[PDB]
Amino acid sequence: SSEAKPGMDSLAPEDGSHRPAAEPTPPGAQPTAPGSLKAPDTRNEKLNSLEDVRKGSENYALTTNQGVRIADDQNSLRAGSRGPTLLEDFILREKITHFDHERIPERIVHARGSAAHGYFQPYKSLSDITKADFLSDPNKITPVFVRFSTVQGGAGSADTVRDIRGFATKFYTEEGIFDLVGNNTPIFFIQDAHKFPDFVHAVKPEPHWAIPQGQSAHDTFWDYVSLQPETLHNVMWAMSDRGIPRSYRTMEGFGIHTFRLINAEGKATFVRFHWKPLAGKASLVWDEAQKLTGRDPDFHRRELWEAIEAGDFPEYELGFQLIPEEDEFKFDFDLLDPTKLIPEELVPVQRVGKMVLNRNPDNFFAENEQAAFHPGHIVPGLDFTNDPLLQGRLFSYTDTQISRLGGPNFHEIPINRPTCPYHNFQRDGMHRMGIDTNPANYEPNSINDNWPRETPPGPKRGGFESYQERVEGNKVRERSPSFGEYYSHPRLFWLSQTPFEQRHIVDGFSFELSKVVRPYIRERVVDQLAHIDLTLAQAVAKNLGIELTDDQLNITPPPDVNGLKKDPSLSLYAIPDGDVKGRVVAILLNDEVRSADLLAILKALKAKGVHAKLLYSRMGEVTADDGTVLPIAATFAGAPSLTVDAVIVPCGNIADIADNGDANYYLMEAYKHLKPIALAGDARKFKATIKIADQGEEGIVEADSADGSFMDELLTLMAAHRVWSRIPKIDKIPA
Amino acid sequence: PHQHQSPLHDSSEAKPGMDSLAPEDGSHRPAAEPTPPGAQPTAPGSLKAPDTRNEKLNSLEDVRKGSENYALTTNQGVRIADDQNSLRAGSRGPTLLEDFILREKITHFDHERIPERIVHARGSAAHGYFQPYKSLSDITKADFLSDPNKITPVFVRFSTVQGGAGSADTVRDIRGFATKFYTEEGIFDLVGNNTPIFFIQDAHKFPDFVHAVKPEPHWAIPQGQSAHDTFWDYVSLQPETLHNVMWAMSDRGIPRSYRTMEGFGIHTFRLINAEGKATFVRFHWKPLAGKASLVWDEAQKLTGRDPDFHRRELWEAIEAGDFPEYELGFQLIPEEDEFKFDFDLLDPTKLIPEELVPVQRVGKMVLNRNPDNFFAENEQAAFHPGHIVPGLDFTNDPLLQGRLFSYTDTQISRLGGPNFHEIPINRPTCPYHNFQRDGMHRMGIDTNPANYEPNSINDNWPRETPPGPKRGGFESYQERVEGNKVRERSPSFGEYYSHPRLFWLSQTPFEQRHIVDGFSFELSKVVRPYIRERVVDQLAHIDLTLAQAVAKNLGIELTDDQLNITPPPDVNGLKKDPSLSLYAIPDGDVKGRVVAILLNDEVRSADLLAILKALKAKGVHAKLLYSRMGEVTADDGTVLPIAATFAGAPSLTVDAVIVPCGNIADIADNGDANYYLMEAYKHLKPIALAGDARKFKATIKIADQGEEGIVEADSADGSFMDELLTLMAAHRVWSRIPKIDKIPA
Amino acid sequence: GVRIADDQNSLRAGSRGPTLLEDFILREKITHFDHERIPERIVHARGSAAHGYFQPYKSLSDITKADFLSDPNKITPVFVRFSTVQGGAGSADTVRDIRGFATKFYTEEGIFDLVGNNTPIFFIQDAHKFPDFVHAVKPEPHWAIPQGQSAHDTFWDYVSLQPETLHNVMWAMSDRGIPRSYRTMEGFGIHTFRLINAEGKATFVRFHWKPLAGKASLVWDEAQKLTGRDPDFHRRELWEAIEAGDFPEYE
Amino acid sequence: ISRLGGPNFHEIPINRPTCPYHNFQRDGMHRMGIDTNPANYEPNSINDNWPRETPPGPKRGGFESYQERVEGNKVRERSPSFG
Amino acid sequence: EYYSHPRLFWLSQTPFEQRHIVDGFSFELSKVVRPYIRERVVDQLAHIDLTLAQAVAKNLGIELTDDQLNITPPPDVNGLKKDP
Numbered sequence A: 001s002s003e004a005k006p007g008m009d010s011l012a013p014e015d016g017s018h019r020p021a022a023e024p025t026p027p028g029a030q031p032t033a034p035g036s037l038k039a040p041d042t043r044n045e046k047l048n049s050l051e052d053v054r055k056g057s058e059n060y061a062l063t064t065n066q067g068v069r070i071a072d073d074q075n076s077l078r079a080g081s082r083g084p085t086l087l088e089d090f091i092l093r094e095k096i097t098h099f100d101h102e103r104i105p106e107r108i109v110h111a112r113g114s115a116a117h118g119y120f121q122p123y124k125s126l127s128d129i130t131k132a133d134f135l136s137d138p139n140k141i142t143p144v145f146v147r148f149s150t151v152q153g154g155a156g157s158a159d160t161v162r163d164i165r166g167f168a169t170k171f172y173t174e175e176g177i178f179d180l181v182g183n184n185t186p187i188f189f190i191q192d193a194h195k196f197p198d199f200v201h202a203v204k205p206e207p208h209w210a211i212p213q214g215q216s217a218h219d220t221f222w223d224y225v226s227l228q229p230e231t232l233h234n235v236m237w238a239m240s241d242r243g244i245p246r247s248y249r250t251m252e253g254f255g256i257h258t259f260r261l262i263n264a265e266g267k268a269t270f271v272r273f274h275w276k277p278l279a280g281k282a283s284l285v286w287d288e289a290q291k292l293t294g295r296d297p298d299f300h301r302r303e304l305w306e307a308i309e310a311g312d313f314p315e316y317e318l319g320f321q322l323i324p325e326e327d328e329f330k331f332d333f334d335l336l337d338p339t340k341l342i343p344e345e346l347v348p349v350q351r352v353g354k355m356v357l358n359r360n361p362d363n364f365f366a367e368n369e370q371a372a373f374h375p376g377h378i379v380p381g382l383d384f385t386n387d388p389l390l391q392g393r394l395f396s397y398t399d400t401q402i403s404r405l406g407g408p409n410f411h412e413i414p415i416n417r418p419t420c421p422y423h424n425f426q427r428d429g430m431h432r433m434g435i436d437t438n439p440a441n442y443e444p445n446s447i448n449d450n451w452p453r454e455t456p457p458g459p460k461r462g463g464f465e466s467y468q469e470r471v472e473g474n475k476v477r478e479r480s481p482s483f484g485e486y487y488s489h490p491r492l493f494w495l496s497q498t499p500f501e502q503r504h505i506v507d508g509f510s511f512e513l514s515k516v517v518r519p520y521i522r523e524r525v526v527d528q529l530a531h532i533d534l535t536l537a538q539a540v541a542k543n544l545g546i547e548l549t550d551d552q553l554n555i556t557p558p559p560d561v562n563g564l565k566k567d568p569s570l571s572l573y574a575i576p577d578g579d580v581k582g583r584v585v586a587i588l589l590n591d592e593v594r595s596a597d598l599l600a601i602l603k604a605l606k607a608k609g610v611h612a613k614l615l616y617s618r619m620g621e622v623t624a625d626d627g628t629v630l631p632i633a634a635t636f637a638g639a640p641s642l643t644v645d646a647v648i649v650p651c652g653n654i655a656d657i658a659d660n661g662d663a664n665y666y667l668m669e670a671y672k673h674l675k676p677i678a679l680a681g682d683a684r685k686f687k688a689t690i691k692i693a694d695q696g697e698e699g700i701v702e703a704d705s706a707d708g709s710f711m712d713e714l715l716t717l718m719a720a721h722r723v724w725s726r727i728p729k730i731d732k733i734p735a
Numbered sequence B: 001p002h003q004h005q006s007p008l009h010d011s012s013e014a015k016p017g018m019d020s021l022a023p024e025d026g027s028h029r030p031a032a033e034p035t036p037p038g039a040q041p042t043a044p045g046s047l048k049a050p051d052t053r054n055e056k057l058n059s060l061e062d063v064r065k066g067s068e069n070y071a072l073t074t075n076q077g078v079r080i081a082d083d084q085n086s087l088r089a090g091s092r093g094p095t096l097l098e099d100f101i102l103r104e105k106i107t108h109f110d111h112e113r114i115p116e117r118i119v120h121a122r123g124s125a126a127h128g129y130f131q132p133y134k135s136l137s138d139i140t141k142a143d144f145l146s147d148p149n150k151i152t153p154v155f156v157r158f159s160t161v162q163g164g165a166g167s168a169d170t171v172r173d174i175r176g177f178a179t180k181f182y183t184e185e186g187i188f189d190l191v192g193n194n195t196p197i198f199f200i201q202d203a204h205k206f207p208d209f210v211h212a213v214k215p216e217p218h219w220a221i222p223q224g225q226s227a228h229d230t231f232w233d234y235v236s237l238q239p240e241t242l243h244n245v246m247w248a249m250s251d252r253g254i255p256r257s258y259r260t261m262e263g264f265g266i267h268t269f270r271l272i273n274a275e276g277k278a279t280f281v282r283f284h285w286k287p288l289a290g291k292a293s294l295v296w297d298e299a300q301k302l303t304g305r306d307p308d309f310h311r312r313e314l315w316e317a318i319e320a321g322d323f324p325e326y327e328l329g330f331q332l333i334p335e336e337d338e339f340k341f342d343f344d345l346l347d348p349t350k351l352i353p354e355e356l357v358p359v360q361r362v363g364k365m366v367l368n369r370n371p372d373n374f375f376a377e378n379e380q381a382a383f384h385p386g387h388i389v390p391g392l393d394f395t396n397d398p399l400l401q402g403r404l405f406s407y408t409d410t411q412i413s414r415l416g417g418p419n420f421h422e423i424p425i426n427r428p429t430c431p432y433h434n435f436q437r438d439g440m441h442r443m444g445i446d447t448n449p450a451n452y453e454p455n456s457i458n459d460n461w462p463r464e465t466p467p468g469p470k471r472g473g474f475e476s477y478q479e480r481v482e483g484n485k486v487r488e489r490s491p492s493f494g495e496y497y498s499h500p501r502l503f504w505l506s507q508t509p510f511e512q513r514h515i516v517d518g519f520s521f522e523l524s525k526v527v528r529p530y531i532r533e534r535v536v537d538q539l540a541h542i543d544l545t546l547a548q549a550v551a552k553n554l555g556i557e558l559t560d561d562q563l564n565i566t567p568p569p570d571v572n573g574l575k576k577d578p579s580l581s582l583y584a585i586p587d588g589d590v591k592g593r594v595v596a597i598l599l600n601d602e603v604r605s606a607d608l609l610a611i612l613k614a615l616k617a618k619g620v621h622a623k624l625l626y627s628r629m630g631e632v633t634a635d636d637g638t639v640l641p642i643a644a645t646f647a648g649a650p651s652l653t654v655d656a657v658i659v660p661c662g663n664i665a666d667i668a669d670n671g672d673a674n675y676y677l678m679e680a681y682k683h684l685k686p687i688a689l690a691g692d693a694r695k696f697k698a699t700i701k702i703a704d705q706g707e708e709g710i711v712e713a714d715s716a717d718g719s720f721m722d723e724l725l726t727l728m729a730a731h732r733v734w735s736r737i738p739k740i741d742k743i744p745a
Numbered sequence C: 001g002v003r004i005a006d007d008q009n010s011l012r013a014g015s016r017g018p019t020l021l022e023d024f025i026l027r028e029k030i031t032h033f034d035h036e037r038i039p040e041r042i043v044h045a046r047g048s049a050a051h052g053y054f055q056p057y058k059s060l061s062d063i064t065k066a067d068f069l070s071d072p073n074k075i076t077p078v079f080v081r082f083s084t085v086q087g088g089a090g091s092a093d094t095v096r097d098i099r100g101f102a103t104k105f106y107t108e109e110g111i112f113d114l115v116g117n118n119t120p121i122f123f124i125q126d127a128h129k130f131p132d133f134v135h136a137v138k139p140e141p142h143w144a145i146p147q148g149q150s151a152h153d154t155f156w157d158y159v160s161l162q163p164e165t166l167h168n169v170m171w172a173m174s175d176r177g178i179p180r181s182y183r184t185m186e187g188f189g190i191h192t193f194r195l196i197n198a199e200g201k202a203t204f205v206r207f208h209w210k211p212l213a214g215k216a217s218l219v220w221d222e223a224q225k226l227t228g229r230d231p232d233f234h235r236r237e238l239w240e241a242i243e244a245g246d247f248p249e250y251e
Numbered sequence D: 001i002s003r004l005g006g007p008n009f010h011e012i013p014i015n016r017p018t019c020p021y022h023n024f025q026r027d028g029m030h031r032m033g034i035d036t037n038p039a040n041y042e043p044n045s046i047n048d049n050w051p052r053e054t055p056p057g058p059k060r061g062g063f064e065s066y067q068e069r070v071e072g073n074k075v076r077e078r079s080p081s082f083g
Numbered sequence E: 001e002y003y004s005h006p007r008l009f010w011l012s013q014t015p016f017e018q019r020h021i022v023d024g025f026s027f028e029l030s031k032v033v034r035p036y037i038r039e040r041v042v043d044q045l046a047h048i049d050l051t052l053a054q055a056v057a058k059n060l061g062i063e064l065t066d067d068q069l070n071i072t073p074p075p076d077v078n079g080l081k082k083d084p
């Protein structure tokens, strides 16, 4: 009955094993913790400015929100032991009221997201092309807050779904907040913002039954796509492995729209923003990603948090595609068309700076959930263009943030606050934090000598002025004829893919269309694919039991994009960029592990910054051949192959795990998913479960012992991400 | 010199770069020192009195925003170049959707308003401090009452009840008097009214009573008035309302200032000491400035001439250094004495007569600083009687019981969520730590690994604190509860006429006349005559003299049966209690009062010098009035600045009128000057006439020999000013009442 | 009520010009879209519902004066929502959790809501502990992990320190925590309530829902993998059974 | 939106049109209207593209803005004619 | 009283249902990072049923103390050992 009474006092273990070490530790070594407790020495101007709202807990009394000390937090106030609860229990009512009101509306789109703190630093001054203060000095450090997201799913949906990913960066500049709100693909599905609710309604769960969550694999999405060919380009990206990234650290970022850079002389240069991952480009395979939404719906959120806790800081290079004003009409596509990409072969990405994400938040709700990004948040030195999708976004973000964040003072929520000064004549509104002392709440005023005052535009610390673009035309609701091309960009993307990426696009479309109940929708989508590429259209049609007509086989292919048939920068894997730091290997233990193998495996993995998870049939410990006590991180079922990048089976008492269904399935799944597998000594007997002949094959590392050559072979395979050459062999594998 | 021309006459007013617009002489800036009302423009508290400070005011510095020498920016910190124009395609073209500066500015403006308070929507607030006279550790373990040297910052909001946030101050209504104590052991809110009782007994009836008093639902009329059918319909059918109605119909319902009214918690609460002993308590606020009220005609007309009179007077008194001061008082009743009275201690429609249980002086509260921003500090302030601290507890009073639920519930929608305690004005100054998370507008960033208890992950922190003599956890007094679950009023509450009778007989004859006139005026506004008759029938159960006088004014004749109604009994042997009268016991202070001085084009400087010297010595303010603004020149050449016109600052706004000598012919035939005196005369205010100004006695129908309340002499001097200040100490000239009815004003 | 001529384009100054603030059609369409979401339920945010009817077998006037239970021919329309507890509105169906079973009875004498779960008991004894228990089971505050799972430190920390939770924990750990369908689980009001008859006599009562389809549950590996292959499995099965005429029935 | 608690303020009885109103807008706080349309987007084939756009015409036609000619640079500037 | 109702439930289950309860606890506790929490939960299970606690402990590499093996089972519920 002591559990139902005040107080329980000290409940922590005497050994202090409840507390995680405040130092970089590998994933699973320590319990995860709020950022300021895990890495207190990791700081920047924004993190430091948040100290005034940080609340501790240690050695403090439990109180009401009014500061009244609570004596009993286990019971309601009642008339007797077994009596009715009394209306006068203000402690119960305050505690329950706050609980009852915890939830706020989720984001209309990108509701599912994971965020981190970091910093940006430019390589050199960009004063020749932009007067933006954050890009003016190589020694200028700009704090950032980045949120990565899916699009369709709710805040409680799964991470490894097939979707476009959001990549939003809040720059806390000395001249205002700049939000770069992008996606992991260089194009969007639609051309004009007016269609945004139509497209979103089509991709989102269907209105009658609210199915499916985090999936475009349903009738309404494909109905919209079939009737709106402008969507075909982004659909091609979503159907590719781009739609299933391995991690937020292994995907690209793009602003999509052409914006303008404005220099001190007033010269405008067209710009498209890019984020290039230091970890390279890497994606999952469909079966692995779908099953991973089951085994770990928080996979990406977890991987992001744990990489930062390990010191494997996600790093991205900021890049600009720069086009002079006089080159506006030099391309086959309209620069203002967000369904069109600018090929890197035509306009190269100029590396401008680097962003490092080095600290997790303290409280997910207060920092991540309440963060408000808006592409309308630009600074002097930047400007918009007439892109009709960007134009509409400018209205949307401010409007949605009012209801989501409960009013017009959302900029006063700590995460959203600028670190630079902010002063104006705006007043009141729900939850007003700032107390204005200004005698005047209007301008022009004489009572406060007209302060705060306007600042003229200038080279630095000047007021914002829009680029004086010449506008000529009649007031029309009309799409520009220049935007009326829908097939060349999807064709360019398709031909830029490797044959194995092309197979994955075919399988992506085939799987999704098989989930469409109305067959005519499938047929209409296949007809659209025939206007892109006949090989793609035939391969999808075959998987759907659809036969193409003679007329469909005679469809003239769309033209090249300014002479380009393909661009290898559009492929995830064509150009190698694979880094092993931060990757994870499963190590399948047995009851009498050969310690020499394990010592060599771990030493080689550590040298490359590759993590390991020791797996067994149960938790606790196992004892090696030399007496070394090995702690078990998880079971074979607990941390499936889906969650790792490679599998290593060291030697020892193999008979212990040879007939274990879970051990054999672990290898079969990793095999099917094209993951590198390494087998030492008697572990080579597992080749039988994966149908591999005695002579072996590429992608299966094997030797008498785990040593120098063995580990170099496995790490080289890990640098290539997956064993693509294994694809013809997986179809026979029951996994 | 005084011919300042505008810096803007052309298209430059539509362009950026208007730059410095303040006058070169710096006359735009008010002096950051105590100044009398109207001497300087009013200003935010931190700019007017920067040296006036307390723990709460100091803790608000982190959210205070400046302005001087700063760039005009968006809420994102982006410097604005042009705040005069929208972005358009050409100078005569359409506004562009891409104008984010316009949209942010208009969005914030479009969302400025929040719901007003359901009741007490009209209010005025100030910062201050409380300090107890001595330790009260024998009766309460409350930290704020434990040491005479312990200073507790306060935030007080005074209010009306019925009217909206934009309604008038000098209405006939009950007034709210809410005090937020920022104690070291939590926030304690003492949420009271200016009368010792409420209209109703059980909280379940609160929406019925409020809906009846509020504007009628079909047409939303009347504002700030109980003078309508529904209110009197409810009163006529609910005799429990009669006691507070008597207070509302008296001059208590029309206070002169928030500084000149009493405050009461109404409910019996409990004080809990370190030994666990409970003592029943009723809270009182005793005004240092004494008790003073307006008269009906004066109050009603003042809602027109200055709907902001009380808000204004409160703000200016603090700016002048005439700080509102109130003594905290306790009526203490031992637990064993619970059933010793004719009335139920838990009945909020019953007062505890001071003759039976005296008010014990406990401490003093001083309001010494105005807020910086009315919306941020006053509008967003959230008071709740449920906000008690260890050393205090509730009782079973059925009105208090329901209040405990209401305040938290209303504050969620009014203040946009459960984090309203994070709004700067509402924040405790003492530590606050718990496992509550999220909610709209969450400011606090919790670093605790645990958001639950019991927990081992944070070694169970924050932790429960056992109850104790000081710094202990809150524990409810272990009151014995015995009875069946019932929706039933206690028979003990079923007495409605003795307390209204006690109040009535405690009033002076002139206060009694004002109660009769209050009821008569209000009931004359009721359209359905049967309602008037039913109310008169209720008055006959209180006092026959009262009922007959009201009935006469309404053309109603009392029946033989009504004339034979047995009067209600005394209250524990008391027929009356002089503490219930505003004026029976003198307590009139002159400091902070205002005198209108009616100037002429050639004022006798000797009179004006003597008048101003004597007023200043007593801390009485003066306003120099004339037929126009600017200046007038005295007989000796002294240049006199005019504060307002006769029409601009009417007699309603002042406590007394002085007319010095000089060129009286200049103002003798001025309608406004004569009406000024006629109005002040009708409203029973002291009037002083020097030399040729005595010719004004003809407009007020006063004989050559004069009368009490009219100060007159050959010149304004020592005796003249002492006579006027003695009249001002008595507040009004009650003896003048029989003469005012013939006055056309 | 204004007829729209073109729902494909924003209003702009020229075919490649800026969007104009005067496009009231665009702004209304985007404003509504921008404000579609409302807060999800604090608990039981993931749920699936259907319309139906209730009918008593005989008059229960001897034990209760409740009008909906007074006549065997009295048909009471119902709205039922089945749910999980921990997960968001976008979380998966076949998680290991307790299930909600809420019934709204549209009676002739007012709405009666029978708000129950698929287990006969709850985790805790006093409502004061509800935010403590919920915060412990929900995603951890620093990183908002895990979704739809009690398989994390804070939940088991609370359970280890609060033995009153053990009973409902046993039920959650059993196959009761992974039902095959909402049609194949029991329902309970958990609390003892009172029935009051016309003579004023009180009888203590505990409410039960007995599935006509019987009791059936998944196995853990299947339930977990099914949160991946079909996170909408229960919502789908409920909708489709109704569309097929295989009406969920409960006594 | 803030004064009336959401985007469905047109469903408040006084604000309701007396003429028909049908579109693809959904949800929002206090949604009164229960949409039966299988589609909540356009173009759609699942509901044969209904509700449909109406071309502008003499009566009962769709709204079209007057094709005013716009010529000028993007400026934050008062017209001298207003001075 | 916290153990007699969990025991009644446990004893009312089929051996395959009991195996599934053991596996439920084992899988969940394997996901708990702090080992002392797993041990404290196993200690609670020992106050319910020793067969249940031992089976969960084995899957977690936890060894029950002599004191834990000597924990007296909670009483039956009004004479019932099981309710099918």
Ligand code: HEM
Pocket: A106, A107, A108, A109, A110, A113, A147, A148, A149, A165, A166, A167, A168, A181, A182, A183, A188, A193, A196, A255, A256, A257, A338, A371, A372, A373, A389, A392, A393, A396, A397, A400, A401, A404, C030, C034
């Ligand atoms: C280039 C095409 C687009 C991109 C790259 C994009 C990207 C994003 C991203 C990354 C977020 C989430 C930011 C966060 O982490 O909180 C988001 C939020 C959102 N976007 Fe966009 N978006 C696009 C187009 C649109 C359009 C056309 C509209 C509407 C006209 C729109 C309306 C919204 C809204 C309402 C939100 C939720 C904002 C909030 O609640 O704070 N987006 N978008």
Ligand code: HEM
Pocket: B116, B117, B118, B119, B120, B123, B157, B158, B159, B175, B176, B177, B178, B191, B192, B193, B197, B198, B202, B203, B206, B265, B266, B267, B348, B381, B382, B383, B399, B400, B402, B403, B404, B406, B407, B410, B411, B414
């Ligand atoms: C002794 C009888 C009563 C007294 C002295 C009293 C006094 C007051 C005062 C002074 C205020 C305004 C606080 C401020 O300045 O912000 C107020 C507000 C209010 N009162 Fe009472 N009240 C009484 C009874 C009730 C009852 C019975 C209820 C309902 C159960 C109630 C509900 C409210 C509500 C809902 C507000 C608005 C508070 C807010 O919006 O922050 N009051 N009361």
Ligand code: HEM
Pocket: A096, A100, C040, C041, C042, C043, C044, C047, C081, C082, C083, C099, C100, C101, C102, C115, C116, C117, C121, C122, C127, C130, C189, C190, C191
């Ligand atoms: C016998 C124990 C309990 C049972 C069976 C139970 C059951 C449920 C169910 C089924 C719902 C979802 C109704 C729906 O489909 O919308 C729910 C909602 C909820 N429950 Fe309970 N509950 C219990 C205890 C609690 C406690 C102790 C509290 C708080 C003190 C609580 C607070 C809530 C809240 C706030 C909601 C959301 C209601 C809404 O947003 O409409 N529940 N509960």
